Structure 1
Amino acid sequence: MTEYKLVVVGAGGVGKSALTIQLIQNHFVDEYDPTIEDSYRKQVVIDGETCLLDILDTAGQEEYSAMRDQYMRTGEGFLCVFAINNTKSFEDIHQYREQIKRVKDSDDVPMVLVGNKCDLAARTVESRQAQDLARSYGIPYIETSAKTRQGVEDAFYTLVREIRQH
């Protein structure tokens, strides 16, 4: 069957693993469990198409940047995750996108911009600022909450559709 190699990237603690575990295991993980590098593989039916979602969950730790070129190189599509209550994570989005472009030798790469932790009332990044950034990249912007599940499937499934149209 068709396989989609998805790679979740973003600064430490923005909820990359929480979003990936919500989608696969239907549970909100609220534990301190920094990620090194993990892979999830699950059969799903998306728009009637049988396909394998192969999702690599990456570390936000910079200690692993050699490990980064490698997985970014094999990825078909990317979820760039920042948190709506961490302005630095939003700023560090540029760095991840510009690394992806250089590892993929392409101006355009299937990608979705994800503003996570939207269940929290203490917001420091305005949805409009993120939307404007996404618009300049030419990619869609989706706000998610791993804790309530808002926009989770949407984020992942959309990315798959952007891969389909590439």
Structure 2
Amino acid sequence: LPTYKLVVVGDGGVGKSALTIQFFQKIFVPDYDPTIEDSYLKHTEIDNQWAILDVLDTFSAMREQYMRTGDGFLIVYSVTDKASFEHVDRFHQLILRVKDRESFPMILVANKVDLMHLRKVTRDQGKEMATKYNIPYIETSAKDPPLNVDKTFHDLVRVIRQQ
């Protein structure tokens, strides 16, 4: 029974926590930022193959353990936060250095696309960035009813399996 350690990274406020709690617990709780580090563990079936998903919602010995051991990374920015998108490169570079690899399983996640009037990063900008890194691109909303939240996590597992 394979365990996949997934790591969610990105700037403050982009929705790492909201995405994770939506995926594991199927709720959206506005302006909830966890008091303590919460680990996430669940059995789920992806393309008929069962897996344990072990997720870190990112000093911390825990963080750096997951950065080192992680099987795949979600790199999240918010479409309403241009800086968060500009900072994606820091996260991409950080991950490749820690894994000492030229590529590693990862998905670029453009979150908060429900806030349409506030969108500062276009679909095509996002897609062009993902292309530059040769990684998948997906748009999400953690807000109910959620968009692409299961697909995002399941797709990362698919990337890991198909490497």
Q: Which residue of 1 aligns with 2:27?
A: 27
Is structure 2 residue 145 aligned with structure 1 residue 138?
no
Give unmatched runs, 5+ long, in structure 2. none
The 8 Å contact of residues 21 and 28 in structure 2, kept in 1 or not, is answered as yes
Contact 1:113-1:139 at 8 Å conserved across structures: yes
Counterpart Cα distance in 2 of 1:39 and 1:66: 13
Summarize the Cα distance change of 1:88–1:56 in structure 2 as closer, same or farther, 3 Å threshold: same
Aligned equivalents of 1:7 and 1:36: distance in 2? 17
What's 1:128 paired with? 124
- State yes or no: 1:82 paired with 2:82: no
CA distance in 1, matches of 2:95, 2:62: 13
2:64 and 2:85 map into 1 onto residues whose CA distance is 21
The equivalent position to 1:107 in structure 2, one of 83, 91, 102, is 102
Kept in 2, the 8 Å contact 1:15–1:83? The answer is yes
Deviation per CA, 1:82-137: give whole Å up to 9, x if none.
Answer: 00000000011100110000000001100000000010011000110110010111
Alignment of 1:1-166 (within 5 A): 1-33=1-33, 37-58=37-58, 64=59, 68-121=63-116, 122-147=118-143, 148-166=145-163
The residue number in structure 2 matching 1:61 is: none
Between the aligned residues of both structures, percent identity stands at 56
Give the drift of 1:38: 2.7
What runs of 5+ residues in structure 1 fail to find an aligned partner? Answer: 59-63
What is the CA–CA distance in structure 2 between the aligned matches of 1:96 and 1:37, rounded to whole Å? 20
The residue type paired with residue 45 of structure 1 is E
CA contact (8 A) 2:16 2:76 kept: yes
Task: Specify whether residues 31 and 39 from structure 1 end up closer, same or farther in structure 2 by C-alpha distance, changes over 3 A only.
Answer: same
After TM superposition, the score normalised by the length of structure 2 is 0.93
Q: Distance in 1 between matches of 2:15 and 2:35?
A: 11
Tell me the distance in 1 between the aligned counterparts of 2:37 and 2:91: 16
- Give distance in 1, aligned partners of 2:56 and 2:148: 19
C-alpha RMSD of the superposition: 1.5
* CA pair 139-2 structure 1, distance change in 2 beyond 3 A: same
